[PDB]
């Protein structure tokens, strides 16, 4: 049924201090190979 009274965004009550970084570690496999500037750093 349709509902408009309950707050559906309850997932952030159970985020720890490493939630963002574990999600980035999970997402690191879904991504394209990064572009290269041809050098390792501008001091190279």
């Amino acid at each position: 049924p349709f509902d408009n009274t309950t707050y559906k965004n309850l997932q952030h009550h159970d985020y720890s201090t490493y939630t963002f970084l574990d999600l980035n570690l999970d997402l690191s496999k879904f991504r394209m190979p990064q572009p290269s500037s041809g050098r390792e750093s501008p001091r190279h």
Partner: protein, 85 residues
């Protein structure tokens, strides 16, 4: 750079010794404070040759033109990135 606009004529610095009484800088060179000002080099050389002074001439040193780019500080693949700002 306003003091670098005109040609100067100075002389060789002669002896400056110590005053025995006060420690002041004594001199015997009359031309030790004599600095002249010329618009061009050729006026200066003509004045030195007219007065019988032996001279030597340094040419004017202008700073060479620089290629300034503020965008070069944030390049993609060059070493000219700044590490901070």
């Amino acid at each position: 750079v306003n003091n670098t606009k005109k040609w100067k004529m100075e002389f060789d610095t002669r002896e400056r010794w110590e005053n025995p009484l006060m420690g002041w800088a004594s001199t015997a060179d009359p031309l030790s404070n004599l600095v002249l000002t010329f618009s061009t080099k050729e006026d200066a050389i003509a004045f030195a040759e007219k007065n019988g002074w032996s001279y030597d001439v340094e040419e004017r040193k202008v700073p060479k033109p620089k290629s300034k780019s503020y965008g070069a500080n944030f390049s993609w693949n060059k070493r000219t990135r700044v590490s901070t700002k």
